[PDB]
Design a protein around this nucleic acid. Structure first.
Ligand code: NA
Ligand code: NA
Length: 327
DNA sequence: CCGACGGCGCATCAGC
DNA sequence: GCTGATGCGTC
DNA sequence: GTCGG
């Protein structure tokens, strides 16, 4: 649907979602607003009344009333008021800094820290993640053209194979689904020497090499199975610098790899559909495994998986290439 | 009326 | 020192 | 906030 259909309503619900998460710290209300915003955004008609919207799953009484108020007034009293509120708007804004959640933002604003400038003034109150988040505030909210993603993939796959040619690396996310742009880079990593029933430096070596060639610039978090950090494409000739990008690298066991690849390829909506249909045919699919729901409903042992298709096979659904996985 | 609503790696806090 | 809780970013 | 036991 075109945005002009019910965009005013969806923007309304999304804004309400953020204040619930960031200010009220009610994560389930946040998701409730987003869900209602999702089903409305995919609704192929211009909504005439809240009663019309209430027919949709995820839209209840309270949102039906807010829609009626929005249709009749072009705005929401509560949303208008919370927008002016100095404390609430400052708290909501600070959570756009990676590393600052609702709890940290609350603390900062409690002691008078409301803006990026105040944050910059009080560096010694920020942790390592929050400093990196503050440093790349602008960059992190920029999106990544597929062209740059493909260049980022070139570097990753090359350095990874350079460290050990036996690595298997797969760039997932919306990129793998063929999206024209992405929000970050998600790299999934496995090795023949790493299984469920089994060296604690496999991830380190990959990160280190990507650091050595100055692709990875900063570290948000790093352990033995997961890396979260920053990366930057090299600049050419005399041209302007590229933005710094968010990049995640996960080390997954070989027997859990393709469940991981499918899972982190997404999308959200596709994965639920696939999960929901997995349920109706007697299987359960998580990030790690596919498991057969038993007589009583007790998941037996994880089944052998050699590819994404192996999983599709089990649940009797026909394989679908990543470009057709938005739902 | 009332509970579910995603579960987890990592960094860091609360506390022994 | 340590264990556990909490916060954070996430399919 | 919405859904459903
Ligand atoms: Na409904
Ligand atoms: Na944040």
């Amino acid at each position: 649907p075109q945005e002009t259909l019910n965009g005013g309503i969806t923007d309304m619900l999304t804004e309400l979602a953020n204040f619930e998460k960031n200010v009220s710290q009610a994560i389930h209300k946040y998701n409730a607003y987003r869900k209602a915003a999702s089903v409305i955004a995919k609704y192929p008609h211009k909504i005439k009344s809240g009663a019309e919207a209430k027919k949709l799953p995820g839209v209840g009484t309270k949102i039906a009333e807010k829609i009626d108020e929005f249709l009749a007034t072009g705005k929401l009293r509560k949303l208008e008021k919370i927008r002016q509120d100095d404390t609430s708007s400052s708290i909501n804004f600070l959570t756009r800094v990676s590393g600052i959640g609702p709890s940290a933002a609350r603390k900062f604003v409690d002691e008078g820290i409301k803006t990026l400038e105040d944050l910059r003034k009080n560096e010694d109150k920020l942790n390592h993640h929050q400093r990196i988040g503050l440093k790349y505030f602008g960059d992190f909210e920029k999106r990544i053209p597929r062209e740059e993603m493909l260049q980022m993939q070139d570097i990753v796959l090359n350095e990874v194979k350079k460290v050990d040619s036996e690595y298997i690396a797969t760039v997932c996310g919306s990129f793998r689904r063929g999206a024209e742009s992405s929000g970050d880079m998600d790299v999934l990593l496995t090795h023949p020497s790493f299984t469920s029933e089994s060296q604690p430096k496999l991830l380190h070596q990959v990160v280190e090499q990507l650091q050595k060639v100055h692709f990875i610039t900063d570290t948000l978090s790093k352990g033995e199975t997961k890396f979260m950090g920053v990366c930057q494409l090299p600049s050419k000739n005399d041209e302007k610098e590229y933005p710094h990008r968010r990049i995640d690298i996960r080390l997954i066991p070989k027997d859990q790899y393709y469940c991981g690849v499918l899972y982190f390829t997404g999308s959200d909506i596709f994965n639920k559909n696939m999960r929901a249909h997995a349920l109706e045919k007697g299987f359960t699919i998580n990030e790690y495994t596919i498991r057969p729901l038993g007589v009583t409903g007790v998941a037996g042992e994880p089944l052998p998986v050699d590819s994404e298709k192996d999983i599709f096979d089990y649940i009797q659904w026909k394989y679908r290439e990543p470009k057709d996985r938005s739902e």
